[PDB]
Design an enzyme around this catalytic site. Sequence first.
Site, PDB file in Angstrom:
ATOM      1  N   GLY A 231       1.035  -1.293   0.026  1.00  0.00           N
ATOM      2  CA  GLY A 231       0.026   0.093  -0.227  1.00  0.00           C
ATOM      3  C   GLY A 231       0.819   1.528   0.090  1.00  0.00           C
TER       4      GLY A 231
ATOM      5  CD  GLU B 115      -1.766   0.882  -4.195  1.00  0.00           C
ATOM      6  OE1 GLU B 115      -1.056   0.756  -3.138  1.00  0.00           O
ATOM      7  OE2 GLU B 115      -3.077   0.833  -4.206  1.00  0.00           O
TER       8      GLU B 115
ATOM      9  CG  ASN C 192       2.492   2.798   6.146  1.00  0.00           C
ATOM     10  OD1 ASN C 192       3.344   3.173   5.411  1.00  0.00           O
ATOM     11  ND2 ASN C 192       2.409   2.422   7.388  1.00  0.00           N
TER      12      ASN C 192
ATOM     13  CE1 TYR D  24      -8.771  -2.115  12.458  1.00  0.00           C
ATOM     14  CE2 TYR D  24     -11.128  -1.627  12.168  1.00  0.00           C
ATOM     15  CZ  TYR D  24     -10.021  -2.312  12.964  1.00  0.00           C
ATOM     16  OH  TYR D  24     -10.894  -2.655  14.046  1.00  0.00           O
TER      17      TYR D  24
ATOM     18  CG  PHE E 245      -3.778   8.913   9.449  1.00  0.00           C
ATOM     19  CD1 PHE E 245      -3.790   9.083  10.733  1.00  0.00           C
ATOM     20  CD2 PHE E 245      -2.840   8.105   8.882  1.00  0.00           C
ATOM     21  CE1 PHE E 245      -2.904   8.196  11.582  1.00  0.00           C
ATOM     22  CE2 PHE E 245      -2.244   7.308   9.447  1.00  0.00           C
ATOM     23  CZ  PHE E 245      -2.028   7.382  10.925  1.00  0.00           C
TER      24      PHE E 245
END
EC number: 2.1.1.184
Lengths: 235, 58, 117, 141
Positions: A29, A50, A92, A95, A154
């Site tokens: 990522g 990616e 990274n 979620y 973020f």
Amino acid sequence: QNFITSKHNIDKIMTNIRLNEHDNIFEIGSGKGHFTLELVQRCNFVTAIEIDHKLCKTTENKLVDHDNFQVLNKDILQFKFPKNQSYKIFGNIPYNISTDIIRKIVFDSIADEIYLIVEYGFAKRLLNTKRSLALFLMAEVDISILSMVPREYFHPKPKVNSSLIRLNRKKSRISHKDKQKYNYFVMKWVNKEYKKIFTKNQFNNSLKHAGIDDLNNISFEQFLSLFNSYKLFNK
Amino acid sequence: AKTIKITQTRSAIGRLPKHKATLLGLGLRRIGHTVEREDTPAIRGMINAVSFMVKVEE
Amino acid sequence: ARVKRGVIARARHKKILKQAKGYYGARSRVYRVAFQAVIKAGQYAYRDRRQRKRQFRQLWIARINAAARQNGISYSKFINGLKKASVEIDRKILADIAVFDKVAFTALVEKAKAALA
Amino acid sequence: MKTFTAKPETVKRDWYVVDATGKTLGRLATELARRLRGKHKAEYTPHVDTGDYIIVLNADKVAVTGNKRTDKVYYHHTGHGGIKQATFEEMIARRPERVIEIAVKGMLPKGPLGRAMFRKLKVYAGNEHNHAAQQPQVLDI
RNA sequence: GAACUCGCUGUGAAGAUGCAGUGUACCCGCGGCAAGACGGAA
RNA sequence: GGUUCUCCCCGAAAGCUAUUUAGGUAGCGCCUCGUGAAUUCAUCUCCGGGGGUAGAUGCGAAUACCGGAGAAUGUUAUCACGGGAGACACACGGCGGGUGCUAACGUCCGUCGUGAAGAGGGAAACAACCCAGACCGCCAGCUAAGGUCCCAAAGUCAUGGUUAAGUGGGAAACGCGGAAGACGGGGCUAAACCAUGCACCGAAGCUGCGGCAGCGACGCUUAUGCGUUGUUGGGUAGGGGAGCGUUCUGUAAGCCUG
RNA sequence: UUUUGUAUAAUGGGUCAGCGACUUAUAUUCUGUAGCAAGGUUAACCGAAUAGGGGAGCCGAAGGGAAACCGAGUCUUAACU
Ligand SMILES: *CCN(CC[C@H](N)C(=O)O)C[C@H]1O[C@@H](n2cnc3c(N)ncnc32)[C@H](O)[C@@H]1O
């Protein structure tokens, strides 16, 4: 999303990673390339995965001056990792497909050095010795916590803080000559039918040999001592 | 010339349409159905077209 | 021309309900499951009409082997000797004379053993 | 016309004595289960038993070929719980005849007819039997 | 919807009372408990 | 979301090309009924070849095609027109070309088999795994896949070897040397593996007997009906044909009925 | 029942009896059948009224070229094989 540069909200995360100039790095990522731009510099050769092609063009626009890397437009859970040589994982991740990566990299990958960033709750729960998933997780790889990243970094603002996990291969010695009883032991342990794995005497004696005074707080070396006791009791 | 007995020994389930057309041109319908043929190179071409499914008798 | 349909539906229900006598409970009293019971019973009869010919042949083979083992010869060698002796007796009545007779089965076994040897 | 069937109130069954000194376990249990089912008679019918009563003596002298005397393991569950696990040697030293019975229970059919057939077998661990009034016959196997 | 409505092993449109193997269980009630299940989202 | 009596024949598709085209529209391809026609069409062999796939990629085979001639088989299986529809998110696997690192029990185009619309037997259970297309009846026989110690129908069969590990009773790299969860049970030292030969069990497959139904070719004949004769009959959506039963009206001031 | 496909982890039925779903009118195309036949046929209406009268109209027997006009042929085609 949760991508961002902020440049100096980075070098500060870009210190604990003690990487050298000869490591091969697989990164899960990339975002817009705030991390890969120094990942090409601080290591030898980068093979990034990616799936978002416009983000891939953004990454190539950020990285017009680098040659020792390639980008693969493959899906993460369908990608098959290389099975020769040695490399390190940097991650990274989003979620809402977090579990889908972790069993991918400990059961279908042979990587020995793992650097990931997750949320606080995931980092807290992963070291909990009650859940069966975590009991499968430290079966081969040691888990450690480095530092905390709060949520103001973020851009699309998240709701909870983040944290860095560093995970190391310990050679395990739980393998084909040892397994198919370990899943038995944990899957009978976390739902509490002790009679199907021990009688009263062996359970009490294994507790007194292990030194466990509270069953609700049990550590991992205590658990492998218990599994060794079960192995000696069951030939 | 000499007459040839031809016997089907297995069915035609899941075969190519060329084998089905060969069986249709040969005159075979079911397992155990015998038939009579005369000696022709074309008939031998039909025989070597499907050798694993029919049985020849001189 | 309005037509009432009370007689026809009652006769149609009584025709089906007469075929489901001797069924446990609600399968022999109401219509909505007696129809399914009748259909399933018909299907089971249609399959067991084929299964009966296998069952009786297996029973005959077991009886033939049990009767032939007493004279010191297995079933397969006995049948092979009978086929080599050109005897066209089938499995049913041979098992019948094996059960209901002893001297004739002994003579048949001796003939088969002489034909094989 | 219909084939013959065996009525349960008119068939005849005899008594036999089987010695078990040095015989193999499975190669004797197979013959015992075949003879108990009634498969050696010309009037054999599957739905009604026709077997003969069988008395087995000297059941503690049965020998097993190979290294099975130390590694053959019998498990038993109480139906709750804990399980009871034993090997061959302490089981023959504790209750011998059960082993032979277990073999017969491995081979007979299942249901009421299976235990009805299993009831006909009487296994003794010694050399003396009290069934001499029934006048049994010696069978060699 | 109809029921003469047991526990484990495996296959499963993926946690089985009904499927294959195996074991236990004389017929019927009476005061409880939460585990299954209905309310519950692990 | 629902749509009510029965039987007999034939029986598919989830594809292609174009568009003020984005849930669209128009043709073509697949199905059925009626009419006509050319030895119409298919399989195989041969003949010199249009291209460039052996031998020797420079010439060019089988296989992806096309042309002519010829024997046999095939209930015209071929084309054109008219009437009537169904379908218009298919799933899994195989062959010839791509992609992905000939990375990965990885991903796209022309073509085929199985289900959708297929019952039965075997692998314990199991939609694509192996054999095999159900008109009906029979307490008749022979076989394919798979098996022959008991559960459970059939060789504790024969010959020559291998294993001592319960390996057999599961497989990935080559360590007796990592191979270890998946024999169904009993339990086996052959009742495990390799090679050979002889028998048997084994389906709704084939044969033996009886019966019904459709389409052809023959002789009497003809409201076209018999008698030989080959042949066929699983089926969703859909097309075609032949029938049962209920109410009322004419035949009916007739017929049956205290 | 919806799906390529279900006991699955998508939905519906407590049981019985009665009631409940391809109809009507007008145009248009095709098929089977009956009378007449180079002809067929009536509407409104009159009428002791399912009889008889009423030919006012409707379809066809000769075509194509927009057309004038040409014809068992024509039309177009420079014009045709
Ligand atoms: C649907 C709710 N989730 C997460 C919500 C959170 N646990 C709460 O506070 O209610 C429950 C599921 O997530 C697992 N879980 C437990 N703890 C965590 C953390 N820290 N992060 C992510 N998931 C978590 C629960 O076990 C349950 O499966």
